[model samples]
Target chain A: RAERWKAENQEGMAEVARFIEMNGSFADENRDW
Target chain B: SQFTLYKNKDKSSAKTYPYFVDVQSDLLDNLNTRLVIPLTPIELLDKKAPSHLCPTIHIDEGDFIMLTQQMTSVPVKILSEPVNELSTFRNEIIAAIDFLITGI
Candidate 1:
C-alpha cells in the first residue's frame, strides 16, 4: 500500500488539498470528525 | 454522524486522524486506500454511541469499522502499526462488502 494518493481523481485530491490548506488547524491530534 | 472524515498530510506521519490506518502494507493493493481496518479509541467509540457514519467493532488491537458509504481515498503509506493481522479482519471486511452490495 505504498502508492500515491492521486489516482483517477485529480479533482478529489484538489479538494482535499484545499480542505487541508483551509482547515490545517483541525488536522492535528485534537482534530474532530 | 457527519458525512465526511479528514486526515493530515500526504505522508504516513499525518495519519494521526481518527480513521487513518495504524498499519502499513508490504504488498501491492487493489483498493487505493490503505486503512488498517479501524481502531477507534474506546472512549471515542463510546462517545459516538451506536453511531458514527458506519458500524464498528473491537478486535485484537482495537475497534474496527467500515466507512462504507463515505469512501474516502486515503493514501496507503499512512497506514502503520502491528503490520500483521490485515486479513483476520474477515468479519468486518465481509460486512463492508455486504454494505457495498446489499446496502444494508
Candidate 2:
C-alpha cells in the first residue's frame, strides 16, 4: 500500500456520498442561528 | 446538484483556467454567490499538482485538473450556462475537497 490511501479509496467516501444524497453537503455542520 | 461545469466569464482568468466546477450544494441555489473550483487543462500544467489535492477529470474529450485548492465563491451571474455537468465524478470531486480541508 502507498504511504497514504487517497480519500477516494476510503470507505467513508461512499458514506459521504450517501449522506449527501440523502441529506446534503455539510448539512449537520450548518445552521442559521 | 453539484459539479456543474461552466465556462469562465472573465477572459483573463479563462486563459489559464478555462472552466470551473460549481460545487455549492443545490440547497444554496437561492444564494447570490456559488462556490466554484477552477479546472486547468492538464496539458498546460508546467508541473504535476498533488494528485489528491487536484484530481484529474475528463471533460469534452480533454483531461483537466480540478484545482480544489483554489476553490472560491463568485457571483452566480458571472458564470455562463452549464457547459457540462460532472455529477458522475461526484466522489472524486468530493475526495479532492476532503483531502484539502481535512487532509484525508
Candidate 3:
C-alpha cells in the first residue's frame, strides 16, 4: 500500500518539480524547531 | 481518536493558528504529549502556499489549511475540548506528513 501510494504521487519528474516548487523546498531546512 | 481536532488553549498563537488535529497514534496515548498538525485560517496564508504540505480542510463552514510543516508535540493540557473530527482527510494528512519527511 505504501509503495503504491508513493509510486502514484511520485510518478514523474515534472510532478516532483512541481511539488518542490510549490513547497519552496524538497523539505524544510530548519536545524531546530 | 486520531485525526481528532482540538481547540488551541494558547490565545496568542490561536489568533493565527486556531486549532490542531491530533495525528499521533493510539499507541502513544499514554504519554503526556501528542504530535499534532496545526490548522491555520486560509485567509491568513499566502495564496501560493503549497496545498500538498498544507492541505485545505473544511470544518463546519470554514476552510483551514493543515500546517503540516508546523507539526509538533504539545502537552495534552494545552489542547482544549474537542472541536471536530477530520478522519475523512486522513489520506491527505498522511501524505502531507510523508511528503514533509521524505519530500515525495
Candidate 4:
C-alpha cells in the first residue's frame, strides 16, 4: 500500500511541491483526473 | 417588452439579456472546487455561448479540488507520483500536452 503522504507547511514552494507530489504520477496510460 | 437598460445606442441590447439571465443553482453547486482554472477569463469567454464550452480536467486534491482547463478535446490524466525532472521527463511531455490543449 502506498503510504499516505503529508506536508508540514502549506505555503509557497512547499505548498506547490506538496500539490505536485500528491498528484504527480509515473505510470503511462493511467491518467484519469 | 425589451426594456432598454442602457441609453447608449452603440451598446447592443441583444448581448445584455444573457448577463441578466441568472445561472442555475445546480450549475454553481457543481462549480465547487479548490482552484478554478478557468479556460479563459469570463470577460473573454461568453458564459451562454456553446462555443465557450471548453474541456476541463478536475484533479482531486484529497480535500481540495484543483482543475486544469483545456481548450482541446483530449483524454485527461491524473498523475499519482511526484513530478520532477526525471519522473515527468523534465516537463517536456507535460508542456507538450498543455500546448496541445491550447491548440498550439
Candidate 5:
C-alpha cells in the first residue's frame, strides 16, 4: 500500500483533521445529506 | 478553518500540482485585520515554489490592497496580478499573502 500522505506539521495537521472530523467532508458527501 | 481551499493538478502528470486557499471576506475586510500567513506551512509542502509560498493579504483602512510573499527572512515581493490559473494559483496566493505580511 502506498504510504498515506501525513502532514509534517502537527498543529496544522491536527487542525485540519479536527475540522474534517467535525465537518465530515466539505464536498459531495455532505451535499446528499 | 476560516479559509476556502482550491487545488489544481494534472492526473496525466502527477508531478505537476498546485494548491492554495483564499483567506475569505471577513478576514480581508476587517478594519484591523490581525491575520497570520504561515510560511512554515507552505515550506512543508516542498513544492516547486517553496520560497514563494504562503502569501498574505493586507487591506488598509482606506481599502488599499497589497499582497506579498516571502523570499527570505527579511526579503519579500509584492504581487500585483491575481492568480486565476489553478495549476499555479496556490503558489501565487502564497506569494500574495507573504507580500502582505512583509509589505514588499
Candidate 6:
C-alpha cells in the first residue's frame, strides 16, 4: 500500500481529492469515531 | 469537521498533540491496510487558545506535526470535538495534499 501511494498519478491525486472532500462527514458521522 | 484529530494515550508529554487518523477510511491505498496519518506533537505553545473548537490548534510555518506523511495508527483518546476549527485547518490539510502530490 505504501509503495502504491508513492506513485504520483492522476488516479492517486483524485483519490486524495475524494479524501479531502469527505473528511468532514466522516469525522462527524463515522461510527468508528 | 473534516478530519479526526485525537490524542495518543501512550505518553503524557506536553510538547505535541500526539494525534492520529486514517485517510478516507484507507480505501484508495489498499482495501485491507489503512492509510494512517501519524501525528507527532511539535512544541507546546506559550499561550493556549481558549476554544473547544480546537484542542490542538494550527500554527503558521513552524516546527510541528505536518500530518502529510504515511505512518501507523494506534489506539487513541478522543480529546475534543473541535468541529469549528476545521474551516481554519482545512487549508492546512489541502496544502499538505498539494505538497504530497507535487512536493511543492
Best-first order by lDDT: 3, 2, 6, 1, 5, 4
TM-score of 3: 0.73
Fnat, model 3, is 0.00
In model 4, what is the error at residue B16, expressed in angstroms?
52
C-alpha lDDT (0 to 100) for residue B9 of candidate 3 = 76
Q: Per-residue lDDT tens digits of candidate 5, residues A1-33?
A: 112223234455467657755766443243211
Writing each residue's lDDT as its tens digit, candidate 2 over B7-101 gives 88777678778888999886545454578898989889999999888989987837999888888867577666678999999998988999998
TM-score of chain A of 2: 0.42
Off by over 4 Å in 6: A1-33, B10-17, B25-34, B44-64, B71-87
In model 2, the runs with Cα more than 4 Å from the true position are A1-33
lDDT by residue (tens digit), candidate 1, B2-84? 12122334454333234533222333243334433333455444344333335564544456454444343344444433333
Preferred candidate (TM-score higher): 1 or 6? 1
In model 3, the runs with Cα more than 4 Å from the true position are A1-33
Instruction: List the RMSD of every prediction in angstroms.
Output: 9.4, 12.0, 12.4, 19.4, 17.5, 13.0
Question: Interface RMSD of the predictions, in order shown?
Answer: 9.0, 13.3, 12.8, 14.1, 19.5, 9.0
Q: Write the per-residue lDDT of candidate 5 for residues B1-104, one digit (tens) a residue.
A: 12333332324322222322334333222212212222223223434442333333222211111122312110011111233322334455545665556655
Q: Score the docking of each candidate (DockQ).
A: 0.06, 0.03, 0.02, 0.04, 0.01, 0.04
Better of 3 and 4 by DockQ: 4
Q: Fraction of true inter-chain Cα contacts (below 8 Å) kept per model?
A: 0.00, 0.00, 0.00, 0.00, 0.00, 0.00
Q: Write the per-residue lDDT of candidate 2 for residues A1-33, one digit (tens) a residue.
A: 232444334555455556555775452245111
- Evaluate model 5: give its lDDT: 0.32
Predicted candidate 6 versus true structure: per-residue lDDT over B1-104, tens digit per residue = 13554444446532454555444433233322234354444555455432222234354323345445444332122333322123455555655655667766
After superposition, the stretches of candidate 5 with alpha carbons farther than 4 Å from their true spots are A1-33, B1-85
Alpha carbon lDDT at A30, candidate 5 = 33
